[PDB]
Specification:
By secondary structure, the protein is α/β, with parallel strands linked by helices. The chain has 22 helices and 19 strands. It is 40% helix and 12% strand. The structure holds flavin-adenine dinucleotide and zinc ion (2 copies). The site of flavin-adenine dinucleotide has 30 residues, from helix 5, strand 2, strand 3, strand 6 and helix 14. InterPro entries: bMERB_dom (IPR022735), CH_dom (IPR001715), CH_dom_sf (IPR036872), F-actin_Monoox_Mical (IPR050540), FAD-bd (IPR002938), FAD/NAD-bd_sf (IPR036188), Znf_LIM (IPR001781). Its cofactor is FAD.
Length: 741
Amino acid sequence: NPAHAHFESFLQAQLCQDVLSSFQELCGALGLEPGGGLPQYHKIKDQLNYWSAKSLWTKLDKRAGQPVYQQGRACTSTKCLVVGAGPCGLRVAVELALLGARVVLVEKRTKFSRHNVLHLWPFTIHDLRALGAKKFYGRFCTGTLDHISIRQLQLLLLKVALLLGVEIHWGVTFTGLQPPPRKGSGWRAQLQPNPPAQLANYEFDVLISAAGGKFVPEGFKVREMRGKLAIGITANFVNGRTVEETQVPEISGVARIYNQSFFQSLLKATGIDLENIVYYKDDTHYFVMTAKKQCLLRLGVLRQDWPDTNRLLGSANVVPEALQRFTRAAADFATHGKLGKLEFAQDAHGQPDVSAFDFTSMMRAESSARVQEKHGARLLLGLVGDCLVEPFWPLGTGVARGFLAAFDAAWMVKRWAEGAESLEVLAERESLYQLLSQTSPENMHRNVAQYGLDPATRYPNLNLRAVTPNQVRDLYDVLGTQEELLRWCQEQTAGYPGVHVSDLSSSWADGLALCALVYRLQPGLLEPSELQGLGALEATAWALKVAENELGITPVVSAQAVVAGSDPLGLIAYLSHFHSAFKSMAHGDLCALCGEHLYVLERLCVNGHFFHRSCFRCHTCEATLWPGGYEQHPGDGHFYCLQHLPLRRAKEEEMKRFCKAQTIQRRLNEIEAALRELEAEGVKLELALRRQSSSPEQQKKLWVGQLLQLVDKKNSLVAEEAELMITVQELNLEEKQWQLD
Ligand SMILES: Cc1cc2nc3c(=O)[nH]c(=O)nc-3n(C[C@H](O)[C@H](O)[C@H](O)COP(=O)(O)OP(=O)(O)OC[C@H]3O[C@@H](n4cnc5c(N)ncnc54)[C@H](O)[C@@H]3O)c2cc1C
Ligand SMILES: [Zn+2]
Ligand SMILES: [Zn+2]
């Protein structure tokens, strides 16, 4: 059989174009009518008598015999379409095909020319070799290697899927869904430029999308997650597979808190600042980095200081030659020269493999499902992979998250196909989406040899009813705090002579109100006899000091403006501190380092002195100085920090500590972005709130209302990152003990 001859040409291919040629040859021939559908598989093991293939069939049988498989009669009438052929899209197509639906895939690209590396969770490893992954790549999961290139996995899963009768039209660009003409008709899809007829009229009632990060489908809004600007570089080197490079240890990567010693060493060697570097020794060596803009400008890698991240990535703007030099230097300095000679990776384009990319902003989807019904037709929309959850690249969570999304989509579509209505399925999928953001090898089951599609075996104790049906009516489509703060103040005033509370401000400048407040904050702090023995300036200084000593709450107002009383908003915030402190348990005005008045959104006191928040940085390393790691020089008043003052479980815990450190750093970047945005908003609002301090009483109450809302939000957050920072010093601490070990 010439058809069977091209079958071994197929199953023995190593390049994508060869797979395409074999498929096209079978398309021209009429030997077996390739890819006609699922039943092909049930006849395909018949006319094959090579012993070496047994395991393949065996494994697929052991994968096609689960009761959850319904023996293939699950959703037979149903008909589907997958846009996107990454690992996630291939998993969606193949798994949805297994249960029996008609499956077609489309791709604008036609050649497997992505040569970078991907990281896989253990469940991804087991589920990936469940499809007989041994056959298509010899070195798969060989020992401790747990990292597979994009094209390798792409080819493996594509060959597996093509053994299971999936239909593909390459060179096809998705651009929308054609509305039904009339009653009883389903949804067609717009594809370009000119797909063949057999798909052009192929009509479907299910669509699961894996378009990736750059494309999201109709009917979904997008949210942006942003941080401080950071650019990254991806580099590759064609490996000679030599022993000298093979014996090289694989540094798991470097993060700012994670290897401060490594940054110090690389600065001493060559004075180069990075933010993150990770090194992968697969077939072609992978180097992923992110770093600091002015260190990157130091070598001139950029010519013009363009704020726009994508346009900063502009090739005309980017100095490529400097990029190659910097990549080479970063590599050979990171690996400590035992690589010896290095040669650039020859890409598909015809050049070295280097590129400049983004590590800051990520798209996100609030909703992972949409059932749209028209002309008596129920249509389902779901997202799998990066289109739903676009991750931080190097965390390596993309493939695992996409495969979890694939299982979610398969389960939910098979549930809806059985006549189940919209409410329960959308509720279930939103219930799993609420947990998807915290997927982790940690919160997964400890042993992995019994997984599948059933959501009960993947999320222990899943409250599937997390979202009531009535919440998704939108997802179905057919055609003055000052009053309450004051009231709390009176509640803290019961039985006090000489304390005549009338507003938020005038009743506190007396001074004894501070003592009464701290009294009922915690009983036994002071004897009642001495209550009438303090002076007003002394009383307010004492109250501030005791509040910092007992609760450690941040002062907002100094004693001079207290007795002056002309800036009540600070005292409002200061009382608001305790207003939020008991919400459950009890139910020189300028700056020199910033040359500006401490405008309240950035006004802060530095151990009994008055400077801005932004100006508080180390002159050497221009970082934020948190308690336990800095100490002020009294000679000049400048602010300086400390150094700146002139076996399987082993690798498992190493990876876990890397991931947790990086997560901490990313969280700090997120908080910094949030603080900058909120302080800009507060600046623009307080412009009026100070200038236009004569609004209507309702307007004045509203302004101060969100002023309090915002300041209380900062209080809660700064507490949260205070505890996170404390986690940082303690993690450095047992790093010191581990070095001591
Ligand atoms: C250049 C690059 C480098 C990357 N490097 C890394 C890395 O080092 N580490 C890492 O963990 N992750 C990396 N990723 C992301 C990686 O894709 C995911 O993190 C993970 O591999 C999940 O892969 P995926 O299935 O999301 O691929 P996808 O993003 O789903 O692949 C995009 C797919 O959508 C298809 N598509 C898009 N538009 C259309 C259309 N109109 N019609 C038909 N098909 C369409 C594309 O052709 C392609 O098949 C990288 C991504 C890119 C683009
Ligand atoms: Zn200052
Ligand atoms: Zn410093």
